[PDB]
Every structure is written in C-alpha cells, then in structure tokens.
Amino acid sequence: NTTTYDYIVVGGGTSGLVVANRLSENPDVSVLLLEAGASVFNNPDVTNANGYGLAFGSAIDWQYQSINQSYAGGKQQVLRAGKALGGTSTINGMAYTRAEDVQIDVWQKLGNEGWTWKDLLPYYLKSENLTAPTSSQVAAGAAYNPAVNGKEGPLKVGWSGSLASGNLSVALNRTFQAAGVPWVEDVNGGKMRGFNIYPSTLDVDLNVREDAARAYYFPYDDRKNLHLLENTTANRLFWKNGSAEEAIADGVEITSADGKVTRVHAKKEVIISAGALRSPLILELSGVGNPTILKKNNITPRVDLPTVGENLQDQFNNGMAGEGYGVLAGASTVTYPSISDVFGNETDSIVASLRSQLSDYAAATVKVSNGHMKQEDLERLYQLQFDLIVKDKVPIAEILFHPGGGNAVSSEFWGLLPFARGNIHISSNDPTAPAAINPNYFMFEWDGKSQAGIAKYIRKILRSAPLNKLIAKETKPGLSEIPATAADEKWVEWLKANYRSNFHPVGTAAMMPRSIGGVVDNRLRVYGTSNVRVVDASVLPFQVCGHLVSTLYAVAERASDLIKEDAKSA
Ligand SMILES: Cc1cc2c(cc1C)N(C[C@H](O)[C@H](O)[C@H](O)COP(=O)(O)OP(=O)(O)OC[C@H]1O[C@@H](n3cnc4c(N)ncnc43)[C@H](O)[C@@H]1O)c1[nH]c(=O)[nH]c(=O)c1N2
C-alpha cells in the first residue's frame, strides 16, 4: 500500500544518492530516499566553491563528539559530517583523488571476490565527468590522463576558474626534485606517488560546489519512481515475523520533522547509507550487533554480529606554516610521498622497528573489541597493511601546500595508514542519543612516528632550493618551539597537542569474510540478513590513500550493478 516501495535507501548522502539514482533507472522500480537533513541547493555556505569551512558548526554539521582520546593526551575530538541532502559532500574540501591500485587489490586478497583496481576502475569512470583544463590552468600545472577519467558521469570534476600560476607553486614544483618526489600527470590512475595539481568536485559552468545532490539527485528529480523524504530520521529497521532464522527486513522506522513516528516498507531490499558514524548504530538499534551491548541497552538481538561498530579506522591531520619575504601565490599542490621519500636514509631502520612491532599492535587491538577480533586475525590484517607500506611502496602521507594569505604558506598533512583501530557504539536505544565514538588516535608508535617524519620532511622542503629563496622563516611550529635538531618525541608531543580528525572514518561495517570479523559480504549484504545492505564508508576494510568521495562514488556505482543483478532472480 501507501508506505510500500521496492527499495529504501537510508541516508541521502555521498553514497546513498548514487544507489537511489541507479536503482531508479528502472522505471518500474520504486525507490524511497530517507534523509535526516534537507536540501542545501540554496545554502550559500555549501554552494560557494570557495566556501570550505564556512559551514562547520552550523545546523548542517552533525559535529559528532568523540570520547576522551587516551593515547593522544585525553582531549575529545569533533568529528564532522554533513547533515544535508548530499551528506558530507556538501561540507567537505572538494578534493578529488582516488587510491593505490594494489591497495584495492588487497580487498580481494583478503577474501572479497570482485574487488580489485581492475574491477573498480570502470566504476570510477562511470561516476565522473571531468572538464579538461584551460590554458591558465595548464600553466598553473593542471593535467590529466584521458584514459582514467570519465566524460559522461554525474559528478562534475574540474579545476577552479581562479587557478593561476604563482611564485609559490612554481618554486614548489622545482623544489620537489631536490626532495626526490617526481611530478605526475594524474594521481587517479592507480599510481598516486608524486606531486600534482589535483582536480576538485566543482561545476565549472555554474562555479558551484559539485556535491552528490547536484550530481546524482537534482538533475533526476523528475523521475516519478524516485521519492525523497527530507527532515526524516531513520531510527531502526524492523523485520518480517516468521521462522526464517535468516533475517528478512520488512522496512524502516522513521521520525518526521513535525513529530510523526511511522513505518515505511520495502518489497525488495533496504540499503543503509548513513555514513561510517551512523550506519553501524542503525544496525545496533535493529538488533544486528554485539548481543552484550544490545541487551544492556534493552534491544532484542536479531543477528549476533559483534563486530558491528568495531574496526573503526581514521586518520589525523596536522598543520605547519611559513612566511615569505613577500606575497606568496599560485596553485594548491598535493604530494603523495612513500616511506622511502619520507625517511630517506633512515628508511630501513624505521622499517625494521615497524616490522618488530606488528604482533604487539595486534595483541593490543584485541582488547578494543573486547576479544571479538582475535590476535591471529589482527596479525594477518596488519601484515597486509605493512606489506603495502613497505613492499609496494604505496604513499604513506598526503601533504597539501597552499598560499595561506598574503605572506603565508600553509601545509596540511596526515599519515595515510596508521595502525590504530577503535570503535563506535550506541549509548542507549534512544536514536537521538550521542554514540560513544573512539577512534583511538595515536594508539601505536608508528602512527605518531610517521606523522613526525612527515613534519620533519615538510620542514626540510621549506628550507630547500629554490623554494628557500622565497621563505624567510617557519612560523608554525617555528624553530623556537621545536628546534631544528629536535627528536621524534618532541614532535609527537606537539602533534598530539595540535591534531584534528582528518574526517576519514572507515571500517565500522567492514566488508571482509564473516570469519575474520566482517560485517558485510562481497556484495555488501549484511551477514545474517537476506535483503539488507550497507553502502557507504562503513564497508571499506582498510583506509585508502586518497580523498574518500571518489572511491565511495565508485563503490556505490558497483554496488548498484550488484543489486540489479541480484534482483534479476528474486
Ligand atoms: C570537513 C571534511 C572535509 C573533507 C571530508 C570530510 C569532512 C567532514 N572528506 C571525506 C568525505 O567527504 C566523506 O568521507 C564522504 O562524503 C562520506 O560519504 P558517506 O556516503 O559514507 O556518508 P555521508 O556522511 O556523505 O552520508 C550520510 C548521510 O546519511 C544522513 N543520515 C545520517 N544518519 C541518518 C539517519 N539516522 N536517518 C536518515 N539520514 C541519516 C546524513 O545526514 C548524510 O546525508 C573529503 N573527501 C573528499 O573526497 N575530498 C575532500 O576534500 C574531503 N574533505
């Protein structure tokens, strides 16, 4: 009847809008989107291509709070997320970069059939429409490889209309030679190491931010089989009652803006796309998760899957600055250094120490999931990551350099692959209550040591020629606070005191085999259910090197094909 649809997609965000778009391509399938926020079509702080940061702390920022971070000096961290049609794509930094090919290949090696770079690449392309650079932008260093960028996809990608060459970016380009990191034409072809003028998620015909709604929703909102409920919060799924021990989702419980708490039903499937900080909570509230936590919070267990909310992996981000003799200008540049780029002469002794620590990191992570992940299993997971870092020389850092205003040069930077793992769990069965989110930042020695290594490497870049002729001094942290010959620990103290979340959480409904603590299968179906999937950052089993939206769009495009395929029987 009147609350029944074929599919229900929970969360009209980065990933959810893809799935809703693709599923509604079949004009005889009905799709309901549920979104807690609303349209931001006309929110200027979203729409503004130069508006990054403006929306922080507003009504469209969930502004989730972590617990005290006991490995990082005790402070709680704000974890930002978009509450809006388009989700976190509405408030993010707009950077478009993907992942290392061999790091996606690891997903299949781990036991997830069909997930490799070769499998995913067509779906990156399918999502994308890249606008080639103008002359001004080419002189500023903009480039791309036509073979790895799409031209028909919903997500417009391009460079700023204001991009121009300037003394800072020109000097940086040459100074990177001294540092040993080559220029590359396109970081998005599976090999990310180098430095590059990366494109952004931007509509250059409007000069607006290209969020997921501008891409996958508004051009398609004429489809009468695609339905949207804004200001509508999904609280939990409910189930079909009947002695199928395997759980069949019947629908979703929802709260509307003006108070009505009701149900909507799905004839085929329910797709959960609320993000890595909410999808696992929705599962827990629906009885899918750790039965000890569920029972404690007065929820009946429906599926005993105790790693829902576990294996949370995030990065942390720090910032450095210097000051020119005069005004610094030009492009914003990304660098993706490997372990040997960052540590140079000392790489092999750094690698040996790391090697010698893996089993201890694994032993220590066991207690985080109260023994639900076994030591053996964490050792094998950490070995896959170690082998990427060292054997395959994937990038271990992102470093952004940009003009900071007038005299200023600013660098933002993060380690890509820390080993720390945490979790997120409901604090009660009230959907409106804040979860306990613990990413465990700085838990393991590598996580801090690598960040300090990156900082030391930036400091050296700023002092290298020809860039050094432009730069009078370092202003942050500056030599007074952290002297030129300072030890790793001196850096780690400062970085701990000054870090923020990089807002890249993954893993909270991980796609791995159930036997090593997976929550979803290789077709993104929740274990123990017939017809529930998770399609968002929750399912990435490991961190990726680049900025998340590109990979999340690709995963949602591929997921969509799998869902369609599965329907051509049932
Ligand atoms: C400040 C900042 C800056 C950056 C980034 C993040 C942040 C916070 N990122 C990361 C990237 O933007 C992010 O990982 C993805 O947008 C996440 O997409 P998801 O689909 O997983 O969740 P996303 O958060 O997009 O979608 C979840 C949706 O579910 C909704 N929702 C949640 N709970 C619900 C409920 N119970 N009921 C109904 N709806 C619900 C939310 O409101 C939201 O619309 C980024 N990436 C990048 O590629 N380039 C960049 O430059 C940056 N920079």
Author numbering: 2 to 571
Q: From the publication, what sentences describe this entry?
A:
The structure of AfGDH consists of two major domains: an FAD-binding domain and a C-terminal domain.
The bound FAD molecule was refined as a reduced FAD cofactor (FADH2), observed not only in AfGDH/LGC but also in AfGDH alone. Both FAD molecules showed clear electron density maps for bending of the isoalloxazine ring of reduced FAD. In the structure of AfGDH alone, we could not identify the bent isoalloxazine ring conformation showing the hydroquinone or semiquinone state, but it clearly shows a bend, as observed in AfGDH/LGC, and was refined as reduced FAD. The subunit structure of AfGDH is similar to that of AnGOx and PaGOx, but the recombinant AfGDH is unlikely to form a dimer conformation, according to PISA39. In fact, size exclusion chromatography analysis of AfGDH revealed that recombinantly prepared nonglycosylated AfGDH eluted at an elution volume corresponding to its monomer, unlike GOx, which is eluted at an elution volume corresponding to its dimer. The β turn between B10 and B11 of AfGDH is directed toward the N-terminal region containing a short α helix of GOxs and is located between the N-terminal region and the corresponding β turn of GOxs. The observed position of the β turn in recombinant AfGDH is expected to prevent dimer formation due to the steric hindrance at the most plausible dimer interface (Supplementary Figure S5 (b)). Unlike in GOxs, no residues from AfGDH belonging to the loop between B4 and H7 lie near the active site, and a cavity is present in the vicinity of the substrate-binding site.
